Structures are given as C-alpha cells and as structure tokens.
Scaffold this active site. Structure first.
Site, mmCIF file in Angstrom:
data_model
loop_
_atom_site.group_PDB
_atom_site.id
_atom_site.type_symbol
_atom_site.label_atom_id
_atom_site.label_comp_id
_atom_site.label_asym_id
_atom_site.label_seq_id
_atom_site.Cartn_x
_atom_site.Cartn_y
_atom_site.Cartn_z
ATOM 1 N N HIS A 41 70.976 -6.868 26.083
ATOM 2 C CA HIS A 41 69.886 -7.437 25.328
ATOM 3 C C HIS A 41 69.874 -8.160 24.078
ATOM 4 C CE1 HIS A 41 70.655 -3.561 22.678
ATOM 5 N NE2 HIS A 41 70.459 -4.702 21.699
ATOM 6 N N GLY A 143 71.776 -4.320 14.323
ATOM 7 C CA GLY A 143 73.226 -5.086 14.306
ATOM 8 C C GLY A 143 74.200 -4.313 14.821
ATOM 9 N N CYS A 145 74.738 -2.553 17.580
ATOM 10 C CA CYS A 145 75.187 -2.645 18.990
ATOM 11 C C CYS A 145 76.269 -3.472 19.310
ATOM 12 C CB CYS A 145 73.711 -3.227 19.731
ATOM 13 S SG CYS A 145 72.352 -1.773 19.716
HETATM 14 C C1 4WI Z 1 71.202 -2.411 18.363
HETATM 15 N N1 4WI Z 1 71.799 -3.075 17.545
HETATM 16 C C2 4WI Z 1 70.259 -1.508 18.159
HETATM 17 C C3 4WI Z 1 70.670 -0.294 17.493
HETATM 18 C C4 4WI Z 1 69.733 0.738 17.113
HETATM 19 C C5 4WI Z 1 68.991 0.044 15.963
HETATM 20 C C6 4WI Z 1 68.486 1.236 14.999
HETATM 21 N N2 4WI Z 1 69.636 2.261 15.210
HETATM 22 C C7 4WI Z 1 70.220 2.061 16.517
HETATM 23 O O1 4WI Z 1 71.015 2.779 17.069
HETATM 24 N N3 4WI Z 1 69.368 -1.229 19.394
HETATM 25 C C8 4WI Z 1 67.934 -1.323 19.519
HETATM 26 O O2 4WI Z 1 67.492 -1.842 18.570
HETATM 27 C C9 4WI Z 1 67.782 -0.986 21.039
HETATM 28 C C10 4WI Z 1 67.487 -1.972 21.756
HETATM 29 C C11 4WI Z 1 65.785 -2.329 21.928
HETATM 30 C C12 4WI Z 1 65.267 -1.204 20.961
HETATM 31 N N4 4WI Z 1 66.443 -0.295 20.470
HETATM 32 C C13 4WI Z 1 66.319 0.969 20.097
HETATM 33 O O3 4WI Z 1 67.283 1.809 19.927
HETATM 34 C C14 4WI Z 1 65.116 1.672 19.659
HETATM 35 N N5 4WI Z 1 64.965 2.817 20.421
HETATM 36 C C15 4WI Z 1 64.360 2.996 21.529
HETATM 37 O O4 4WI Z 1 63.417 2.473 22.046
HETATM 38 C C16 4WI Z 1 64.577 4.395 22.375
HETATM 39 F F1 4WI Z 1 63.880 5.704 21.909
HETATM 40 F F2 4WI Z 1 64.186 4.427 23.622
HETATM 41 F F3 4WI Z 1 65.869 4.515 22.563
HETATM 42 C C17 4WI Z 1 64.583 1.722 18.269
HETATM 43 C C18 4WI Z 1 63.286 2.394 18.086
HETATM 44 C C19 4WI Z 1 64.700 0.565 17.627
HETATM 45 C C20 4WI Z 1 65.522 2.806 17.629
HETATM 46 C C21 4WI Z 1 66.846 -1.863 22.955
HETATM 47 C C22 4WI Z 1 66.670 -2.952 24.046
HETATM 48 C C23 4WI Z 1 66.469 -0.643 23.964
#
Ligand code: 4WI
Ligand code: 4WI
Lengths: 305, 305
Positions: A41, A143, A145
């Site tokens: 992503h 950030g 991830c």
């Molecule tokens: C990567 N850097 C982030 C890590 C997230 C941000 C907040 N804490 C974390 O662990 N990953 C993301 O932003 C991923 C990414 C899009 C949205 N996202 C989410 O983790 C979202 N979660 C969801 O939509 C859910 F519930 F399905 F897991 C969020 C609401 C921002 C926490 C993708 C492509 C999944």
C-alpha cells in the site's frame, strides 16, 4: 532471579531498515541482499486505500517512482514486483550488513520481537505474541508500516512479521515476509473484525513455571487434575484447549522444577475458579499468556546470541 | 495506537560488550575508547566475596591476570585502576565501534534500557526504572554483572547503570559508570535489604495520559483536587509526594489532551481509594509507574534514533 518481558538484541535488524517512498506515501522497508521488502500500500494515496485495486495501481508505477533511502544514501531501484500484499524492490546493491536469515510463518501462540521504525529509523523494540485470532497487541503509529517482527537463533534472524494495519479494537495486523496476511484481514481501509481472542493456555502454564522458579509459589496446591477435567473448566474462561503436544513442550520446565504439568493445571484451574484475591504473580494481577515455554527457558538459563 | 513497554534499539551498545575474566571469575565489560569498564568483584574468589578487602586483593592483581575478549580477539591490558566499585582496564586498542557517549547518574523515577549479557554476548533487552529505593526490577543470572543500562538521545548513548548484585526479594542493584552505587548498597555478600519501595506518582499520572491518548477514558471524572489534598491521599497508599516540578514536567501531556494535572490527580485519587471496578487500563489491572512523561511523549510521537 527476576522475570521480565525481554526482546532480542536488535542490532542485526537495525542494519536492514530502510525508508521507502512512492509519491507522497512514506513507510519502512527491509533491505536483505539487493531486495527491499515493504507493504504494497506504499503505492496508494489516501483515497486509493478505501477500495484499492493494487494490480492497476502498480501498473501506473515504474522504477523511478520508488525512492529507497538507507541512512543518508539513495538506493537505485532497478526492478519491482508484487508478491501477495508485499512489494519487492530490486536495488543496485546488496546490503553489506545483511545477516544470516530466513523467512518463517509462525503459529498462533508463538512470540517475536518488533523493531518499531519510522522513516527507516528504529524507535524501539518490544515483544509480541501472535494471538489465536491472528492479531498482535503492539504500538504502531502513522508511518510504522514495514516494521518487522523476528526471532534470533544464535546468528540467524528468522523474520516472521511485517506491519500493515490497525484494527478497530486497537489491535494490529500484518503479513509474513511473503505478503500473506496472518488471519482473515485485507489491506483495505474498510471495517474488519478480529475474532474473539482466546488465552494461550500453554503460555500461562509456562509463566506459572517462571513464577515458581522465581520463588512466587503461593498459588501451588497439592492437588492434581486430568487433561480432560482441566479443559472442561478452562474453556468456560475462554482458554485454548490444552493438548498432549502442549504438555510435551512444557516437559523441560516440568523436569527442571519437579512439578508435573497436570499438577500445575490444578493450580491454574483454582486461579480461574477462585481468582487471585489481591495477590500478584511476578508483579502481575492478571494471568500472563505472552511468554512461550521457550521464552521462559531462554530467560531462566541465559541463552546469548 | 497501542501503548507498550519499549526498550531502545540496542545495536550501538551491542558493539561495546566484551568478556572479562580474572582467575575463575568471569563477567561482562563495557569497551569505550581504549578503556574496559567492569565490576571490581571480578578479582574476587567465592570466599573473598563474603568479606573482600578490594584494595588488598587488587594490589595482588596484575595486568596479565585480566583476560579481555572482544569476539574471538583477546585484548592486551596495558594498565588498570579502581574507581569506587568499578575497574577500568586500559587496553592497547580503541573500540572502533565506540558510539558518541556520555556517563550520567540518573534520579529515582527515570527509566533506561538494560542490555542483559553473559560471557560478553547480548542475550536480551528490556526497560527498567530506577526505583525510589534505588533498586531495579530486572532479570539477571550468574555472570550477568557488567551488563549496562542506557538511554539514547538520537545519536548519543547515555550510560547510566552497570549491574553488580541481586537483593533478597529478587530486585537488583548496581552502580553508575563512575562505580558509585545507586542506593546504600555495598559490593559484599553480606546481609542487605532494599528499603520499603514506594510508587512513582508522576510516572503513574504520565501513564494515565497515555491511556487517555489511546482511548481508555473511563477513569476520567468531573472532579478536581488540590496538590495538598492529593498528596495527603497518596501518602496513605505509599505513593511518592507529587511536587510542582512533577506537575511542570507533566505540562506537555496535559496540554496535548486538554486535561489539567490536578483533574488527572482526582482520577488517580478515585482509583486509589475505590479501585478499578474490574476494569483494565492499557491492558493492565494495576497502576503502572515505570513510564516517565518523556517515555509517553516519545512513544506517542514516534521519535526515531
Ligand atoms: C501503516 N503505516 C499504517 C499503520 C496504522 C496507522 C495507525 N496505526 C497503524 O497500525 N497502516 C495503515 O494506515 C493501514 C493501511 C490503510 C489503512 N490502514 C489502517 O490501519 C486503518 N485500519 C483499517 O482500515 C482497518 F480497521 F481495517 F484495519 C486505520 C483506520 C488507519 C488504522 C491500509 C491500506 C489498510
Ligand atoms: C554478577 N555477576 C552477579 C549477579 C547476581 C548473581 C545472581 N543474580 C544476580 O543478579 N553478582 C553477584 O553474584 C554478587 C556479587 C557478590 C554477591 N552477589 C550477589 O548479588 C548476592 N547478593 C548479596 O550479597 C545481597 F544479598 F547482599 F544482595 C547473591 C546472594 C549472589 C544474589 C557481590 C560482590 C556482591
């Protein structure tokens, strides 16, 4: 003496953390040999994440769209491909700090260290268990991830986790180093639910052995139980069934203390039925399930790397 | 989201660990520049430790009596001196992996990461707080002496602890890198007990701000207390007195959340007097006091090193 949640020394993993940018999306990558592995992503914008079609998004990307930064140095991306939810970037050079490594897929109940990173730089290290519902209880921000989870066996780093997302109940989800998610999760910004979380029973017993080795022995009784009788009780408390394989894994701890696994189950049964009555075990008021039988042995016998 | 006990990345400290042997006693050393720091009891035999005359024992020790090993390389000791409870062995080679470092003496309440070692090799990493009674709740076995505690300020490693001994309740004691013990302890195998410990109040308040930041807001109430009324209740529960300096240190957390420190103190008072009503705060059934306000800010901001 003393018993703590202990992470592996992280120096070998630090030398592999790089920063990956694509457009205005920035996250972390794992540089081993001449390949950088990061969550796919990284190619999305905020709008793409609601319902991404990664195949088309990647087609619109070419080598000059990915910037890889290792320290103050830019690494030339000379190739890219998609493997499940992970992106592989072929870079111009092999990481001189690449350790001996392998990519493993861990079982539920197994633990690993997480080296939390931001912009390719290490922030901290903490221990995590793969819950039976395939989530981890970590600490991840925007950030984060691309941060990886691993274990060390003397000189070899077994990588098992890469962070991708956070679920509604604050729990975390990610993939193995091949891009396969642990659990029924997808890398899409849409409401998804993790199942009901159960307690890893073999781990609670392991921690009770750690408490015994440390002199915390108030919970021990002179009672015994059968495996079936214990399982009938524990399951009402959302504890995973205990199997003969789990008892064989508890063997070294059992032999070291002289307390048979079923004698320890009678103490665990009593703790579920009657509670802890204001007492603590290893400084905890709850029963702890994030230490495996191996984590106890490693900590109590001083295994170095 | 997620709040976890997190240690600093250990890579920088890993490269400074060596093995120090004198006779049959073997322990860990810290090699910075051309100097190796280790506990002075490395010169003691098992009977010497009951009543050691260090001045006399060291006079009968020569450079050739100290074996220093950095990986597979043996370092030549060309001089030595005893500074309080620490030995400083001058070697003929500067450590090429010496990071930017400083030696500091920490105060009770401040935290640090311990890299636990055996035979000069890293085994694991965890975070500890200097208790008000100057002990630490670590995890150390025979041969762990000379393992160090440290903090990282981006590129500089602040060394603040060196492990020397374990006290009766399974708690640990050690010195700063000048050989001065934290607390009233001495390096002799003689009857010593840590004084009655107290709860680090500012760290408990900083941890409740971390809970509000992560969504656990059930303990917040409409009430407000004074500093004096709070302190009269804290003392009953064996909590450290909260000073204006502690209130000022909590300032950035108070402003980020829009909750006044004395409004959070009313939350803590209610929690101490009436309990947690079967609830957890950040996954814990007890009030945690090992996160300083700087740890909460660092983790909630994703500070990198
Ligand atoms: C990567 N850097 C982030 C890590 C997230 C941000 C907040 N804490 C974390 O662990 N990953 C993301 O932003 C991923 C990414 C899009 C949205 N996202 C989410 O983790 C979202 N979660 C969801 O939509 C859910 F519930 F399905 F897991 C969020 C609401 C921002 C926490 C993708 C492509 C999944
Ligand atoms: C350093 N390598 C060890 C680490 C100890 C060993 C067991 N767990 C630890 O943390 N240090 C020692 O063996 C020191 C050392 C002599 C005695 N010793 C102790 O820590 C002993 N404790 C005490 O003497 C007491 F009670 F006063 F605190 C021991 C009984 C072995 C735990 C010296 C020179 C103090």
């Amino acid at each position: 003496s003393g018993f703590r949640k202990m992470a592996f020394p992280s120096g070998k993993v630090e030398g592999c953390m790089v920063q990956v940018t694509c457009g205005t999306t920035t996250l972390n990558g794992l540089w081993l040999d001449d390949v950088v592995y990061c969550p796919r992503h990284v190619i999305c914008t905020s709008e793409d994440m609601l319902n991404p079609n990664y195949e088309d998004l990647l087609i619109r990307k070419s080598n000059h769209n990915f910037l890889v930064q290792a320290g103050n140095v830019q690494l030339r991306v000379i190739g890219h491909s998609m493997q499940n939810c992970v992106l592989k970037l072929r870079v111009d050079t092999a990481n001189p700090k690449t350790p001996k490594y392998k990519f493993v897929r861990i079982q539920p109940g197994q633990t690993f260290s997480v080296l939390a990173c931001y912009n390719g730089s290490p922030s901290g290290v903490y221990q995590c268990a793969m819950r039976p519902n395939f989530t981890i209880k970590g600490s991840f921000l925007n950030g984060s991830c691309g941060s990886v989870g691993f274990n060390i066996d003397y000189d070899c780093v077994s990588f098992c986790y890469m962070h991708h997302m956070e679920l509604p109940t604050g729990v975390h989800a990610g993939t193995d180093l091949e891009g396969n998610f642990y659990g029924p999760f997808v890398d899409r910004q849409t409401a998804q639910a993790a199942g009901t979380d159960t307690t890893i029973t073999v781990n609670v017993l392991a921690w009770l052995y750690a408490a015994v080795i440390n002199g915390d022995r108030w919970f021990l009784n002179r009672f015994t139980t059968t495996l079936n009788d214990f399982n009938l009780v524990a399951m009402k408390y959302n504890y995973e069934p205990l199997t003969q394989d789990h008892v064989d894994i508890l063997g070294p701890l059992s032999a070291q203390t002289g307390i048979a696994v079923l004698d320890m189950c009678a103490s665990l049964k009593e703790l579920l039925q009657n509670g802890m009555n204001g007492r603590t075990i290893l400084g905890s008021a709850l029963l702890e399930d994030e230490f495996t039988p191996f984590d106890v042995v490693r900590q109590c016998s001083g295994v170095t790397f």
